[PDB]
């Protein structure tokens, strides 16, 4: 229902939606950072958020910075009970420095709906058709897909 | 309920499920790409999608390509209102070239359920037990976990 | 509602919550691994899980390892029908070796709520205000955001 935030400084910007049904609110750097090639920066938003009940806040990469500048977002799990400064962990996999300026949109926050399950240790799980299958078990192409189901 | 898609070319493949309760529909490259070591490619699916109400489309990495070939997916946030070509941002962190061929399953699309909250600026948030705690505050092992809760 | 797990060895640890409303259960390595710079390891938890109905298990990076050690999690999509050993695909983008020890919390499992939609091929999708817009279409700063909506 409501995403609450408070400013921790004059340098913060209220997050904004790129489009009417955008998955995420864009997050603004409060500061300048130089991210050297193959290095990381923790970008302060200088906001604290209170996420609505039944989600967490996922810090996700924008596609523009990813495709154009080889920028990625690490970490990314903002918990419903976190009241600290929301930090964006930026990864520069590019060959050139990446310059963040105060007021640049360098990530997006998604209200990812989750269950908060109680954990239950059991001795044996039920079986499934997938079973232990993983790590490319279903193959690479359309034939492999359809072979797998026979 | 329904994931709608339309083909933007003869080169596209309808996405397929790896298993009965797979989280994602596998996405097929429509083209050949050579991804050099420590470089990226934007892989066209040549599909446009209309995601159901209450989710976005997350482009996620397959575990086979990740574990075997050090392949990763950047960006990944397909918005409910996006009607463009779904692009997969592929990252090759491996030492060898990675070859994508038309018809290779090189990612998966998950209908991630999200809230579309209205954003509300407040002066002060409520407090929590976690508070400002983050960035490894709870430590590395089982003792650290249980110490934290005392 | 319930996250079921079974131990596949004496070396496993039941996953634990970092905080009362943590998004994820922390996952413990069952073994020692040396992750060389710019290399990957598949870390065995030696647990199998049965995820509740209506989610998948996303293996997500912790922020401490990300910010301090340039550690990232690849792959990450644990399907509801998977009954195998949950593996964490760890990426070391740092300059130094990263040492995993048995009993280290090196990732977190989130019960990400998803739709399992039936897929429907159509000839034409409806139009939207975003349309084909993506890959940085809305720009870099607050002016660009507000220009875009005019
Ligand atoms: O990080 C991960 C990712 C996947 N897995 C396992 C469980 C999951 O259900 C299974 C398949 O995951 P993906 O569908 O994401 N990868 P891929 O498509 O390559 O495997 P498959 O061909 O078997 O579906 O691999 C892990 O153990 N750790
Ligand atoms: O990208 C991020 C990730 C996390 N955080 C903050 C908020 C989050 O609630 C808190 C802890 O996140 P994680 O649980 O994902 N990382 P870690 O387990 O290392 O921290 P902790 O030991 O405090 O739980 O760190 C950020 O500010 N930016
Ligand atoms: O992996 C992706 C990510 C995004 N996209 C497309 C669809 C999505 O709706 C659109 C915008 O995604 P983001 O909002 O995550 N990136 P960015 O903010 O840079 O683009 P924009 O300024 O247009 O919102 O780009 C892809 O095709 N593949
Ligand atoms: Mg955007
Ligand atoms: Mg799969
Ligand atoms: Mg944590």
Author numbering:
A (entry chain A), B (entry chain A), C (entry chain A): 81 to 230
The authors write:
Deoxyuridine 5'-triphosphate nucleotidohydrolase (dUTPase, EC 3.6.1.23) is a ubiquitous enzyme in DNA repair that plays a key role in preventing uracil from being incorporated into DNA. dUTPases are widespread in organisms, including eukaryotes, prokaryotes, and some viruses. On the one hand, it catalyzes the cleavage of dUTP into dUMP and pyrophosphate (PPi), which reduces the possibility that dUTP will be incorporated into DNA through DNA polymerase. Herein, we determine the crystal structures of ASFV dUTPase and swine dUTPase in both their ligand-free and ligand-bound forms. We observe that the swine enzyme employs a classical dUTPase architecture made up of three-subunit active sites, whereas the ASFV enzyme employs a novel two-subunit active site.
The prokaryotic expression of full-length swine dUTPase was difficult, so an N-terminal truncated form of sDUT (residues 54–221) was expressed. In contrast to ASFV dUTPase, swine dUTPase (sDUT) is a classical dUTPase. The α,β-bridging oxygen in dUTP was replaced by an imido group to form 2′-deoxyuridine 5′-(α,β-imido) triphosphate (dUPNPP), a nonhydrolyzable substrate analog and potent competitive inhibitor of dUTPase. The sDUT-dUPNPP-Mg2+ complex structure represents the prereaction state of the substrates just after binding to the active site. The swine dUTPase active site is inseparable from the trimer assembly as follows: one subunit provides catalytic motifs I, II, and IV; another subunit provides motif III; and another subunit provides motif V. In detail, as β12 is antiparallel to β3 and β7, the C-terminal β-strand (β13) is swapped to the adjacent subunits, and eventually, the C-terminal motif V reaches the active site opposite of its own subunit. For example, in swine dUTPase, the corresponding four amino acids are Cys, Glu, Arg, and Ile, and these motif IV–corresponding amino acids form a long β-strand (β12). The Arg193 at the end of β12 forms hydrogen bonds with an adjacent Arg193, and this rigid structure fixes the direction of subsequent amino acids, which ensures that the C-terminal β-strand (β13) is swapped into a neighboring subunit. Moreover, both Met99 of ASFV dUTPase and Gly167 of swine dUTPase offer main-chain oxygen and nitrogen atoms rather than side-chain atoms for hydrogen bonds with the uracil. There is 90% genetic similarity between swine dUTPase and human dUTPase, and their five conserved motifs were also consistent.
